[PDB]
């Protein structure tokens, strides 16, 4: 059997990996925890199988993997039990797959969980890495940097006839980021070839932007002026209309004293087809609200 | 001066702090949000001088350490904010404490936070305790064990006429226990004798049980039966009425697989008054409910 579990398949990363796995040639079973929502018909009219099952149940997770080659495993920490669910969850996968034989995982993690970050959701991360690794299950882990995907909801606003983006970043900080597609490619890939990718972790980015430098590509494509501005990280914690703000503001904090350290022309050498934040900016036809 | 700031001063391990100075002879200064609770008023009336601040209002934190000559440092997880807010709380007493030129910060953190534990609510202190060694502020750390005092809220219930301590537990597991009010013995202890407490950590318990163990000595002081009985992770992690469940889930497993390495027979050397966990039971006058 050639099917890979993915969970998180109605969200971004887990989206992503249907999309290449299926395009790759793989059978893809996707958890939801509801079949009967538009998302998961719209996966199931892409073609693939539904099973019903929640990360927080155990008994669940195995019989999703049942019979399964691979699973991709991620989780969010943005829900009522926060991080402490989000650890649980990842390593009840990794239990569930080491229960029902599964012979391949790709687990997303984070840029940085394995460089002592402190950055509370990093850590999970890192702590479900470590338990993978005990298990001996042949994994591979992904270690995405800033999802461009997240200028979606969180993109610069028009302020006097200028695009302000405004992040807690200072002017100076350079950030990598990815593509979710890319993820999905990479994560696909490495099912594809276990030689390379089983013990392997790789850390993902295909662009390394400032904030000014990432105001620029929102201004050169709206044919706008634009500039960044930064935000303090005590305003950044407090802000109400951000989930999990404090936590967020420590990353923020960490990409302006740390960052992420993926090797980009290493990783376009193996992936021709990385995208740039040029090409995510096409890809989804950004316009200004 | 030789006033001590004593933060989270209407909480157990404040509190304790506060009684622990002032039996030295140290003059002290509490911080509070609100000035006007009946918990603050009683630290006035105690002769414990109040300052105004808030643990996330950074320019709050450097008016109450001003001439002061040590800081006792804690923080809490379980608010609004959580682990983040917790996190950027400590890092920003250590700042403050930086800025203002104090002399000697204590800072409570929690056992095994240098083991590599992965439980969110330790990480976070290891993560504060790094942020004190980075910024050179003469500190020392403690890192008490399972708190005594969780048993005035979460103590046994009878069932059948016995006494049940249920908790996330094996029956072997051994769980090492402090007294709160001996954390503020070291404290202050620590701030009277710095030559041998600056830059020492130190882990805190005055006594080591099983679940079997814990459930007899109630069972002893109630003169009536008592017996241990094992709760699973899942289902404490789920517990909608405990706070946090899932993190606290994580540490219970973290219990069972690990643990914490105090040397009790050395801090009894030091602190010969140290509590055992019958001492506690005698203290509080811990009755049936
Ligand atoms: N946004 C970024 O820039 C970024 C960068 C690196 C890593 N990450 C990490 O990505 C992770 C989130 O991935 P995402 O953006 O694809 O998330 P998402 O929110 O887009 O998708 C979450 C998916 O998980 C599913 N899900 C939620 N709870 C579930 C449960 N109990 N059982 C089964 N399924 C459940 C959701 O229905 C959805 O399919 C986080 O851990 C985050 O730290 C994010
Ligand atoms: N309970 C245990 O067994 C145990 C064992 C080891 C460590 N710990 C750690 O102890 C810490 C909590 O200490 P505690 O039990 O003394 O807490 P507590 O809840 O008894 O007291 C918290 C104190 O902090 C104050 N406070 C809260 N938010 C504040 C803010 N924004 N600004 C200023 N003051 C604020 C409160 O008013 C109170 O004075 C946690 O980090 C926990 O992980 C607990
Ligand atoms: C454009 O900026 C954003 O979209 C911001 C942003 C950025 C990241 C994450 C966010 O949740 C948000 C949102 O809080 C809105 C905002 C403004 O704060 C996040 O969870 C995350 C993550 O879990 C893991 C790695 C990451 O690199 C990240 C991020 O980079
Ligand atoms: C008797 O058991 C308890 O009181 C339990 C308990 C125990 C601990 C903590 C709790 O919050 C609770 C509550 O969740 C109720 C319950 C039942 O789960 C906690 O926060 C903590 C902590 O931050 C740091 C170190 C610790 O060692 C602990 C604890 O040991
Ligand atoms: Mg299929």
Not at 29 to 34: N, Y
Not at 96 to 120: E, I, L, M, N, Q
Not at 176 to 181: C, G, M, P
Request: proline letters at 6%.
């Amino acid at each position: 059997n050639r099917t890979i579990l993915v969970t998180g398949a109605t969200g971004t990363q887990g989206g992503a990996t249907v999309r290449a796995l299926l395009a790759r040639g793989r059978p893809v079973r996707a958890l939801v925890r509801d079949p009967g929502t538009d998302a998961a018909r719209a996966l199931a009219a892409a073609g693939v199988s539904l099973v019903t099952g929640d990360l927080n149940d155990q008994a669940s997770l195995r019989a999703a993997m049942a019979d399964v080659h691979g699973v991709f495993s991620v989780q969010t920490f943005m829900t009522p039990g926060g991080l402490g669910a989000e650890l649980r969850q990842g390593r009840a996968v990794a239990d569930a797959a080491a229960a029902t034989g599964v012979r391949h995982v790709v687990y997303s993690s984070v840029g940085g969980a394995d460089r002592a970050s402190g950055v509370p959701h990093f850590e999970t991360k890192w702590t479900i890495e470590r338990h993978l690794r005990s298990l001996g299950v042949p994994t591979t882990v992904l270690r995405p940097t800033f999802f461009m995907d997240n200028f979606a909801a969180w993109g610069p606003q028009a302020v006097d006839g200028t695009l302000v983006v405004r992040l807690p970043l200072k002017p100076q900080t350079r950030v990598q980021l990815i593509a979710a597609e890319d993820i999905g490619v990479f994560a696909a890939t490495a099912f594809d070839d276990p030689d390379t990718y089983v013990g392997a972790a790789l850390e993902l980015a295909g662009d390394e932007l400032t904030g000014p430098e990432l105001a620029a590509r929102f201004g050169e494509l709206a044919g706008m002026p634009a500039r960044f501005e930064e935000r303090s990280l005590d305003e950044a914690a407090a802000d109400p209309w951000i989930p999990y703000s404090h936590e967020i503001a420590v990353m923020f904090e960490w990409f302006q004293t740390d960052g992420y350290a993926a090797d980009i022309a290493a990783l376009r050498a193996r992936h021709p087809g990385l995208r740039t934040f040029a090409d995510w900016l096409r890809a989804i036809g950004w316009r200004v609200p």
